[PDB]
């Protein structure tokens, strides 16, 4: 099944957090994340979200598990097991897929350690990067960064992203405060 990374990062250094939290609250970006990770093409299927343990624990109490999606939590301590109908515990993406039944799309949703490893895993064929801009990038506190060899990847045209997201609205240069952001798709060369 189709495995993709979905992330929002501040250019050009591709920062994603400071002190274990996100340096922005972008309202439309959140809805985009929600729609893309939920939308299925075929009947009787749903999407999977894979995340690290720390990321799982960072999600607001009443937002976890993320509804309408199969949640996979990663820990190097976990046994490959099905907790309930919505939650799976695993020690690798390799194992979690073998435990999965009838999943259409798989989304890697965080965090920094999970991103920086799975980026070089050949099962991952797509990057969904919300590229964020700011007039003064250095003036925002940042400690955790993406380590993406984007030279080895190809930014696709908007029309390929539009096919991927289906009937989802893709606006240009979304301005929330001083931040400006765009949605982009990447594939392996
Ligand atoms: N902008 C964005 O789209 C997003 C940004 N973020 C940011 O990222 C930061 C979180 O990153 P981080 O602290 O690294 O959290 P992670 O979600 O990456 O948690 C890391 C944990 O995942 C487990 N793990 C890591 N690698 C593997 C592996 N290969 N196989 C199995 N388990 C593994 C380990 O658990 P264990 O110790 O149990 O073995 C480890 O402790 C936050 O600051 C947040 O702001 C997060 C999500 C999205
Ligand atoms: C920015 C949303 C987001 N956008 C994109 N493009 N990629 C991502 N990987 C995430 C993400 C994320 C993590 C899992 C997260 C952390 C959190 O705690 C800070 C709250 C939410 C969340 C708030 C609102 N609704 C559902 C989930 C999501």
- Ligand 2 centre distance from Cα of residue 30 (Å): 6
Domain holding 122: CATH number? 3.40.430.10
Q: Please state, in angstroms and as integers, the Cα–Cα distance from residue 186 to each residue in 65, 119, 127, following that order.
A: 28, 12, 5
CA 23/CA 165 separation, integer angstroms: 26
Distance CA 96, CA 21 (A): 26
Residue 9 CB: number of other CB atoms within 10 A? 19
Cα three-residue angle 45-189-6, rounded to 5 degrees: 40
Residue from 15, 18, 30, 58 whose mutation best tests the ligand 2 pocket (most atoms within 8 A of CB): 30
Contact 179, 133 (CB under 8 A): yes
Cross-strand partners of 183: 130
- Distance, in Å, from the CA atom of 22 to the CA atom of 28, rounded to the nearest integer, reads 15
Q: Which ligand is nearest to the CA of 61?
A: 2
Query: What is the chain written as a DSSP string?
Result: -EEEEEEEEETTTTEEEBTTB-S---HHHHHHHHHHHH--SSTT-EEEEEEEHHHHHHS-GGG-SPTTSEEEEE-TT--SEE-SSSEEEES-HHHHHHH--SEEEEEE---HHHHHHHTT-TTEEEEEEEEEE-SSGGGS---EE----GGGEEEPPHHHHHHHHTT----SSEEETTEEEEEEEEEE-
Method by which the coordinates were obtained:
X-ray
Q: How many domains does the chain fold into?
A: 1
- Calculate how far, in angstroms, residue 42's C-alpha sits from the geometric centre of ligand 1: 30
Identify the domain containing residue 159 by its residue range.
1-189
Regarding the beta carbon of 129 and ligand 2, being less than 6 Å apart is answered: no
Ligand 1 centroid to residue 55 C-alpha, Å: 6
Ligand 1 binding pocket includes 7 (Cβ within 6 Å) = yes
- What residues contact residue 179 under an 8 Å CB cut-off, 6+ apart? 24, 26, 132, 133, 134
Which numbered atom of ligand 2 lies nearest the CA of 107?
9
Ligand 1 atom with least separation from CA of 76: 39
Data resolution in angstroms? 2.6
């Amino acid at each position: 099944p189709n495995v993709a990374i979905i992330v929002a990062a501040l250019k050009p250094a591709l920062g994603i957090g400071y002190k274990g939290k996100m340096p922005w609250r972008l309202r439309k970006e959140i809805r985009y994340f929600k729609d893309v990770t939920t939308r299925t093409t075929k009947p009787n299927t749903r999407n999977a979200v894979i995340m690290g343990r720390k990321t799982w624990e960072s999600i607001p109490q009443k937002f976890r598990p993320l509804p309408d999606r199969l949640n996979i939590i990663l820990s190097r301590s976990y046994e490959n097991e099905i907790i309930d109908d919505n939650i799976i515990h695993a020690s690798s993406i390799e194992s979690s897929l073998n435990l999965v039944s009838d999943v259409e799309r798989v989304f890697i949703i965080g965090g920094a350690e999970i991103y920086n490893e799975l980026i070089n895993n050949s099962l991952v064929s797509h990057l969904l990067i919300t590229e964020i801009e700011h007039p003064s990038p250095e003036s925002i506190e940042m400690d955790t960064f993406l380590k993406f060899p984007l030279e080895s990847w190809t930014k696709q045209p908007k029309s390929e992203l539009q096919k991927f997201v289906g009937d989802t609205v893709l606006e240009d240069d979304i301005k929330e405060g001083d931040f400006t952001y765009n949605y982009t798709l990447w594939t392996r060369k």
